[PDB]
Swiss-Prot record:
Keywords: Phosphoprotein, Transferase, Ubl conjugation pathway. One of its GO terms (cellular component) is cytosol. The gene is PELI2. Interacts with TRAF6, IRAK1, IRAK4 and MAP3K7. Interacts with BCL10; this interaction is impaired by SOCS3. Pathway: Protein modification; protein ubiquitination. The chain holds residues 15 to 258 of 420 of the full protein. This is E3 ubiquitin-protein ligase pellino homolog 2.
Amino acid sequence: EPVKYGELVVLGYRRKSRFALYKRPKANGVKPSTVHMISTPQASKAISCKGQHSISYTLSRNQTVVVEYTHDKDTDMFQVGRSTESPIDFVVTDTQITQSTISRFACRIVCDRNEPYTARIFAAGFDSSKNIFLGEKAAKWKNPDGHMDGLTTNGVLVMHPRESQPGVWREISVCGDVYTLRETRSAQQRGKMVESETNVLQDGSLIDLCGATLLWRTA
């Protein structure tokens, strides 16, 4: 206290085996805000919203829906990825020629700055343009609340361990909704919405980042 939210542990072995999440000096959380329809040149490589975070839902090579994300005084955000760029809080790598399946900016853990300091997981992380890019191939749709949501290329999966049956892996979307697993990992296909489950991380939750599995432990 410095309030500790919890701990991420890399199963099977800054780049460390263990990452403590602490309440930040200043809130860095973000929340969805204004939605923009933007025209993009064929050569577009990055989109950025001046002074803000954003998620880009690519509709075609000509147009992208850009959801602006503004300051959230009530949360802290932590990012996990294979990238060593400054937006990544916790660097994770895969557990002659080597390949990685882990995304540069893989996920966000977002923690309430006030009691009970609930932690929640979201697929994807914001890059150095403070942007998350969902390309034409990525699954994207409008949810029952009318907001745009999407899956990353490979997905972020979570299992809360376990009347009756043992824990099941679910896919988490970019906006933190819960879906059943796709038919195959990386399938160009979205699973079934699980309305009765949430992206709240419970003690002992496993997070599959496609190349590494993390364990969340509440403080």
